[PDB]
């Protein structure tokens with residue numbers, strides 16, 4: 001029933017970079033999704049205690065959320081764009097794994113994912 005610690009957002013020994021693609025992922029992709037009317041359920045780790053979902057972290061073994069992504073981007077935690085893109089995809093996929101088609105939370109994820117895909121279609125070439 002208990003919540004796990006959140007995903008790591010700081011690790012001094014992890015090699016990391018700031019690339020133009022990672023800057024786009026913060027300034028365009030994260031910013032666009034974060035301001036969306038459906039962002040709020042995804043802006044922090046799921047509190048499975050307060051939502052009374054004792055099975056949540058028993059089923060979702062690789063949790064991810066945009067609060068964590070935002071911190072990772074702000075801290076320049078990533079090595080490359082694909083690592084960050086993977087975090088977004090994990091977040092969406094986790095939603096579809098845990099919930100049912102047509103559930104409000106799924107509709108919310110689908111709207112965010114549509115925008116995500118539109119923005120990453122225009123990811124700049126690495127300079």
Ligand SMILES: Cc1cnc(Nc2ccc(N3CCN(C)CC3)c(F)c2)nc1Nc1ccc(Cl)c(NS(=O)(=O)C(C)(C)C)c1
Pocket residue numbers: 040041042046051052053094095098099104105
């Ligand atoms: C990211 C994420 C992924 N998956 C889920 N699943 C989920 C499934 C069932 C429920 N409940 C169904 C109704 N019960 C009375 C309480 C439990 C739930 F709260 C969440 N939750 C997520 N975040 C999240 C964050 C905060 C809120 Cl308040 C919501 N609630 S909600 O999904 O019902 C909605 C956003 C539509 C109000 C979800």
